[PDB]
Amino acid sequence: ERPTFYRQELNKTIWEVPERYQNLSPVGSVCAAFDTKTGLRVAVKKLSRPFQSIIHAKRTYRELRLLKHMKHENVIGLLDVFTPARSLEEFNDVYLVTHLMGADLNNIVKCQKLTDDHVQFLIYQILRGLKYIHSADIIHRDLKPSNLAVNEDCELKILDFGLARHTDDEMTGYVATRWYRAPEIMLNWMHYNQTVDIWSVGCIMAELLTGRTLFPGTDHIDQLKLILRLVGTPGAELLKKISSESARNYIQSLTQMPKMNFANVFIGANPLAVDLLEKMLVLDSDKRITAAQALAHAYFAQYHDPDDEPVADPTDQSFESRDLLIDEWKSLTYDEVISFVPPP
């Protein structure tokens, strides 16, 4: 039942995998490989020190559950999950396997100029799995071009969980590309929205059009200025940001910025597209368009079909509000790796 494994050291780390995964090849933690069982290129992720603390433990279970759960054409699926371990007691390492696509937004945009019809199809596809993720009450907090895989037939898959949270979860502060990232995150709001992801799409989508990075900061205040240079300084409602009363006075100290007309910035863009961005790049997350409503936006006329824009299933997030020791999280997790059912 248990395949022969084999350990080999890749870049200061050990990697014990079953022998159906050949030619492990680091990308950055991830290797690329070739799966003999099926003959597809895959990506293996070894989780970094799971079960190191009560919070990593929790972190690991959560990720795994989510991946097990995602079953949508525009969201990546778990091909395999495994561990070298032969029982719960030696159990300490976790590997996830997924399909390697061929390309991603990151690199197709460095080298091809995308026409509008391209953009439509791609953004709609992104939006369409966001509608799927957000139905499970999940904010994937790391939308960005390299986490958006595309393949030859131009299908799109959203890629990276781990930073994903359930919505009413006290938000924590984290490591990632600041370019695609909502203001409210950058101000460390303890609570925040699924519309944070809409901000990203907004940014990702303007990059497709123009060829360039919308807001290419170099640190947070540079990031925050670049943003204001476009959407303009906000009104007094602003009291809202108590979350950071040291950040509040640093915005009120900032020079006063007029809101730019998007149609004067995005020359040659479809007016429908520019309209849609104007509804994505508002600093007030209350007035920011949802994935669902955005799917209804006329820009997507050509592709919009509700009945193939499905919602996700009944789940138990129950655990989110549990306090267990490491060893509890450990077992819960182990069981899930055992109970894994692999797609055909």
Ligand SMILES: CCCCCCCCO[C@@H]1O[C@H](CO)[C@@H](O)[C@H](O)[C@H]1O
């Ligand atoms: C450049 C200055 C940053 C502007 C502040 C961000 C406004 C986002 O919106 C805020 O987000 C919160 C949670 O998502 C909501 O609870 C607030 O009611 C809402 O106003």
